[PDB]
Amino acid sequence: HMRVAVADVGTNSSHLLIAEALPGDAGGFRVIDTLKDRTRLGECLDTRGELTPEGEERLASALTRFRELAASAGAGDVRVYATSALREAPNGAEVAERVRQRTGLYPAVISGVREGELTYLGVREAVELGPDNVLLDLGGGSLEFVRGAEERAADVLSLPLGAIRMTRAFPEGDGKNAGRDVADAVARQVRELLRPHAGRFAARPGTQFFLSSGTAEAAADAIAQRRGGRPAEAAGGVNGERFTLTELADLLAHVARLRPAQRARVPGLERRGDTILAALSVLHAALDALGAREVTVSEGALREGMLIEELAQVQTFSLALSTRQRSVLATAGRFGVNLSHAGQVAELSRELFDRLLAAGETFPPPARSLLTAAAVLHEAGQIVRGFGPQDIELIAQIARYHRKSLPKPSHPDYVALAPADRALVARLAGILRVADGLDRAHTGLARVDDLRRQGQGWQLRVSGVTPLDLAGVGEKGDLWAREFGPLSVQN
Ligand SMILES: [Mg+2]
């Protein structure tokens, strides 16, 4: 069964999940392995918010450990999403490309809203959600608020209220009440930024509140040990633990009275003494402003959401395919290709093909089928079932197109298709290269919004793309330009 590796790069730490899909095409997975790396990019940002070469080194090291664990488990490629620290760094795009060059993995920045939607799915995989749920996810950089029902987020708000960010924003003095003063000021900042949107996430009869990520997990462990319990490692973690806003307030008042070095010795807060005071003030102030009385902590988060969405995309693509095209996908899988990438390239290829047809481009009847198959097979190294021998030669020549044919036209075994077929191969290859460029970062997120004639050329509007995707289209769209005319890409 399919083995998949997903990872997220946050502000305090990075996380990897390796899992195997469950039989029945039902969108489920079994966990194989998990890893956390204390990357702490938020402590590697200069005054303008740029990630330093030290943070780049810590990023590359995390992604190298991740890539080795995935390879060690047969997972193959690792999809990597990145949140607040890379998102906000003026040099974020340049840093992500440099890290790809050093590790092979590309940390693709996602929006706060998509971060929230995916985190909620991970929470859904770990704890019991009801008809009306509010999730708070506090990281080092940002705080997401998410409201939804039993299956997915309906509303997401992202605010710059992260724990690292707030610790650095409100430097602590050395007085007796210096801790309380930090806690009060952080809470005022929380209310100031949350007041205009709080109604969207406020408690109503029956609302359940949930918390994810490291601060909340540390708070749950520390609160349970204050109730008389053992360290969270017994009971298998803190997943599904509940605590009250009163227990949180009491933990916060205790932390506030201690100096930073004593905070590291509070049970359950041992690995978070430096940011924990501001982090607990954020959670208390935000929950209090929404009227929450009790929370449930979830160990599921962003990486579990990425896995669900990836399996969902793959299995939805596979389900709607014809029997013949499904056998191509199974063949490609046996060739060890990445099925998430192949499905996305084929869906993007169909989208571009269909718009060209709408704008009056002419194609022969089997063109869409040939393009789909070559899109699924494009990364099979072995090959450079419902298809006749001509169609399979066409597919192979589309999948491995080059301007200089590896075998010279005079070389024995050179395969010279008829002129109409030569023309078809290049046009469809030109589409396939543009689609491949749109999933260069392996995010599965790109979408075609519009494709229109622009003089003797074309204008393409896309969403869900990274800087790496946009550059891929520029580099690989030369063939499109030679066959369809100049192509400009937007958004
Ligand atoms: Mg590709």
Numbering used by the authors: 0 to 383, 402 to 508
Authors' text:
Degradation of polyP into phosphate is involved in phosphorus cycling, and exopolyphosphatase (PPX) is the key enzyme for polyP degradation in bacteria. The PPX hydrolyzes and releases the Pi progressively from the linear polyP chain. Bacterial PPXs share conserved catalytic domains 1 and 2 belonging to the catalytic N‐domain, and most members of the PPX family contain two additional domains 3 and 4 in the C‐terminal. The exopolyphosphatase belongs to the ASKHA (Acetate and Sugar Kinases, Hsp70, Actin) superfamily protein, which utilizes a common fold for binding and catalyzing hydrolysis of ATP phosphoanhydride.
Protein crystal structures of PPX homologs from different bacterial species, including DrPPX from Deinoccocus radiodurans, AbPPX from Acinetobacter baumannii, and KpPPX from Klebsiella pneumoniae, were determined and refined to resolutions of 1.8‐2.6 Å, respectively (crystallographic data together with the data collection and refinement statistics were summarized in Table  1). While the KpPPX and AbPPX crystallized as a symmetric dimer, the DrPPX crystallographic structure exhibited an asymmetric homodimer. The AtPPX has a ɑ‐linker consisting of 9 amino acids (Gly298‐Ser306), the KpPPX and HpPPX have ɑ‐linkers of 12 amino acids (Ala296 – Gly307, Gly285‐Leu296, respectively), the EcPPX and AbPPX have ɑ‐linkers of 15 amino acids (Ala296 – Lys310), while the DrPPX has a ɑ‐linker of 20 amino acids (Ala300 – Ala319). Among the PPXs, the DrPPX which contains the longest α‐helical linker exhibited the smallest dimeric interface (1136 Å2) as calculated using the PDBePISA server, while the PPXs with shorter α‐linkers had a larger dimeric interface. The shorter α‐linker (AtPPX, KpPPX, and HpPPX) enabled the C‐terminal domain 3 to interact with domain 2 of the N‐terminal, while the longer α‐linkers (DrPPX, EcPPX, and AbPPX) facilitated the interaction of C‐terminal domain 3 with domain 1 and led to a relatively loose dimer formation. In the DrPPX apo crystals grown in the presence of ammonia sulfate, sulfate ions were observed in the cleft of the N‐terminal domain of the apo structure of DrPPX. In terms of the polyP hydrolysis activity of the PPXs, the DrPPX with the longest ɑ‐linker exhibited the weakest activity, while the KpPPX with the shortest ɑ‐linker showed the strongest activity, demonstrating a strong negative correlation of ɑ‐linker length with PPX activity across the species. Superposition of apo‐ and NTD structures of DrPPX revealed that truncation of the C‐terminal led to an enlargement of the cleft between domain 1 and domain 2 of the N‐terminal.
